């Protein structure tokens, strides 16, 4: 009855990666003291920062890194049929130097998911962590993509556009392996002139813009005309802006499609046929206003559920959707739209 | 019946500025052959580019640089009661160097608008062109803001955020003079990583994001708590995304408001009380979807109309709103909302 499309399991220590790195790269952790950097100059102004208070546990363990707490607190407690692990490994994809090392960690992150998460539970599905280098990412996708519980290539949203023709081999590898594209913000997003907007509360209100840029980038570069069977899940960008983007791009393309002649359809088509959007973070939306938005969308196949466990704005699956919506809709958003996406 | 809030008068050539510049800066046009730069690597793939086919006339004159044609084709032809001239002078405001000269051009642009446009027709109103530097921007507002037909300070949208405390002296100087803030895109907006997104059709699709950052920046830096009678006109960024941003910022703020303790109201109160949005460019929208957007806004006082004369996606007043809406809403969008905004 419910498929969770955004779960952030984690490593509890950078040392969890040493057992999967070649001996060259083991040194960067053991001897050269490599730690992952995040560039966001701010965070949630609350105790427990980005997490639920009850996700840390008693062993001082980073939330999301304890498999057993994941099982109890989320999979069992909230009756999850299938959870799509997102990871907390975006750092390797949005890395700004040491790209060779970054590719090594990508493979290392995926070994850790397969061996310490996917293989320990049938309800867990995985996303492939990739470096941004298209050659290495195709090489990683070919490596762990054949895995049966691997459903998604994770294109972490950074300060570049995935739909650029340089990354087109990565989409082809994912279609050649029956995978969807997941897309989730990273913490490094900046905006015009590269500024962070001074406050986390402002940065948080802005970052759906980066999601919007990626859908424009996928559509205008003809990614969906080249691979019309590829689907892309936008995870945690919201969805209330979606009818606006559909209308704007349709109107833009009615006058000017000759600039990108490889785009054969109307942009709102690729929204219905090739893209899914998570409902998290859910905000109090009346059932009248929610149904308006579905109607402005022209489909009920486009929304999916996610909890974002273990993050502070966690959404519980029986407490989020407006109660007055049809059970048919309720089941499509809670289960069917995702199940179709992941061939589940 | 109609107040047009986006009209783009222009100079015919950089020699129109020379009478209004000091001798020092005359030389930059006379001897050093200065020409404004725009950085956009693309434009509309169409004959006439960004302009209407009938806007050039037969003089080879730049569209919108011809007072008499603007009168016949726009003010008279479409029966405009008041036009808010927005100019095409954002280059001075979004200048990236030679700032001292940029201030001088700002004044010369305003001198041009006053002497050759505002003082030649009573249905015309003006925006104040400013340099970005807040000291000299205040100097210019003080100098030309007392002109009886100047209703707006033009805060041209580039690759920075106007809500920054750096700029608050400009906000204050507008309110002290009884002027609103206009906010219109530049040619020079980029996005994540400072990229342009390869095709003008993509760039068109994305530049509403920059409007989104401006309204976030205004709220979170407390511009409207500092000046609660100050109103801002987002002109040509669209409006169908207004509901999503009001709810996104309201959800953020319920939980994180102590980060910005100067923000005393709810974000969506500022949207209703402090912000006004243009309808251009108008995309077909059903009557019910349009009314659902207004219900979602919680106010019928936020939408205004503009033609965007002389650009290629010009809207005509008798033919843009949903033909099924009440005369009460039609008059509020076409006239009343702007008339309250500009104390007209
Ligand atoms: Fe997430
Ligand atoms: Fe989150
Ligand atoms: Fe305009
Ligand atoms: Fe325009």
Numbering used by the authors:
A (entry chain D), B (entry chain F): 29 to 372
Study text:
Dinuclear monooxygenases mediate challenging C–H bond oxidation reactions throughout nature. The protein components of AibH1H2 stem from a largely uncharacterized structural superfamily, PF04909, containing over 100,000 unique proteins that can individually function as either carboxylases, hydratases, hydrolases, or monooxygenases. Representatives of the latter enzyme class—collectively defined here as “amidohydrolase-related dinuclear oxygenases” (AROs)—include PtmU313 and AibH2,9,15 which employ dinuclear cofactors with different metal identities. Herein we utilize this “guilt by association” strategy to identify four candidate AROs that can each harbor redox-active dinuclear active sites. Each of the four candidate AROs can harbor redox-active diiron cofactors.
The genomic neighborhoods of candidate AROs stemming from Litorilinea aerophila (A0A540VG95, referred to as SfbO), Afipia carboxidovorans (B6JH23), Cytobacillus firmus (W7L2Y2), and Geobacillus strain Y412MC10 (D3EI84) intimate disparate physiological functions. Each of these proteins was fused to an N-terminal His6 tag, recombinantly expressed in Escherichia coli, and purified as soluble protein preparations. For initial studies, the expression medium was supplemented with additional FeII sources to ensure the formation of an intact dinuclear active site. Aerobic samples of these Fe2-metalated proteins were found to exhibit moderately intense UV/vis features centered near ∼350 nm, consistent with charge transfer bands classically associated with diferric FeIII–OHx–FeIII motifs. These features were diminished upon anaerobic addition of ∼1.2 equiv of sodium dithionite (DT) and returned following reexposure of these samples to air.
